[PDB]
Design a protein around this ligand. Structure first.
Ligand SMILES: Nc1ncnc2c1ncn2[C@H]1C[C@H](O)[C@@H](COP(=O)(O)OP(=O)(O)OP(=O)(O)O)O1
Ligand SMILES: Nc1ncnc2c1ncn2[C@H]1C[C@H](O)[C@@H](COP(=O)(O)OP(=O)(O)OP(=O)(O)O)O1
Ligand SMILES: [Mg+2]
Ligand SMILES: [Mg+2]
Lengths: 192, 195
């Protein structure tokens, strides 16, 4: 419906600057019934953007997971140690593919063969700008060995069962493994 | 395999510090945790964006095989999206003492004018646990899509179209991606159960 010409970003006021940033967006935007809004302000968490890799072995039908503590999970989770996808922050001028492949090697010792885009998503766009771009990457699960990080090699079915049971419940891994559950048959044919 | 190794007993949160307090907060977590090789970590600090937690409702009409989406501006999408107006699930913050289902039904009525019949849990996920504590708990809710009526516009589309838009990237916020991928995996049984 509406485009960026229908929004006026008046200011971005730094509320906090540390490792991450918190900015106050001051803006006006067009209304569905006509006209422009008044001035609106929103606190937005700015932490850059990330690349995500689902390491999938199409020959063996196995996924490689990585385990590490995420203290932000503490208050609402059984444990702050999460089972996650390979992922890393994207710095200026870097590509999703470069970051994804680099992180797979350094976080899991995985050489990546072919890749395909899965999806790129906004983690929580009401309060943060963060975008994460997911690839699926062809890996040899027998070469996975491995910031304190532990590598897990599991069947695809087990990984998806853990999504269903809530044992895997971070957005990137849920999105990637749900996508795999929807596409693994065609993906295994294509990569075999 | 076994799964995760350590539990909350294996981490020591030494202190928390509010670095910024406004509508939301930025807190500094200070903690120590055991290492996979057996030893103890050093003292660690992390900036964590604290904004409470949310309830999400996927409004699904099993008779018509349609979903109801809500469109509204999310300014934070501006920098990485062609448009900051997003197609989203019904959603609202959970305040103390409220249940997910209570918020979900209330938000469904006031964001989309929808009375909700039966509900089922989909999933509860951490939006981005490296830097924010936020958890969002998703339910699917039985609605009559023909009755579907913050500046918010209500959209009614078939499940296949909505899932196509996930694949095309036109729906690309986590809550809606997770819910609609789940729907694509479960709609057959859900339609049987609710018919
Ligand atoms: N929430 C946070 N608040 C403050 N600093 C953080 C936060 N999360 C991570 N950091 C810092 C700590 C680390 O020095 C740096 C990157 O951490 P980490 O992800 O463990 O490194 P890495 O290079 O092994 O992995 P990757 O590149 O995949 O992110 O970011
Ligand atoms: N990032 C933000 N910074 C400051 N205020 C905000 C922010 N996001 C939302 N608000 C305020 C504006 C609204 O008056 C109030 C709730 O907004 P709205 O999105 O319509 O409701 P909601 O129940 O869906 O909340 P939420 O999006 O937090 O889940 O929160
Ligand atoms: Mg990582
Ligand atoms: Mg609302």
């Amino acid at each position: 419906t509406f485009s960026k010409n229908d929004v006026e970003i008046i200011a971005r006021e730094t509320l906090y600057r540390g490792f991450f940033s918190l900015d106050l967006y001051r803006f006006r935007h067009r209304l569905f019934n006509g006209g422009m809004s008044g001035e609106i302000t929103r606190e937005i968490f700015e932490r850059g953007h990330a690349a995500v890799l689902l390491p999938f072995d199409p020959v063996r039908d196995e996924v490689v997971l990585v385990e590490q503590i995420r203290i932000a999970a503490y208050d609402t989770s059984e444990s702050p140690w999460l089972l996650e996808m390979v992922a890393g922050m994207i710095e200026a001028g870097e590509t999703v593919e470069d970051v994804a492949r680099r992180e797979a090697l350094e976080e899991a010792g995985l050489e990546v063969g072919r890749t395909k885009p899965i999806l790129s998503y906004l983690a929580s766009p009401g309060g943060t700008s963060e975008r994460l771009s997911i690839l699926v990457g062809e890996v040899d699960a027998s070469t996975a060995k491995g910031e304190d990080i532990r590598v897990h090699v599991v069947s695809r079915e087990q990984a998806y069962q853990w999504v269903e049971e809530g044992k895997i419940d971070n957005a990137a891994s849920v999105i990637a493994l749900q996508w795999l559950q929807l596409h693994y048959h065609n993906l295994r044919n294509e990569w075999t």
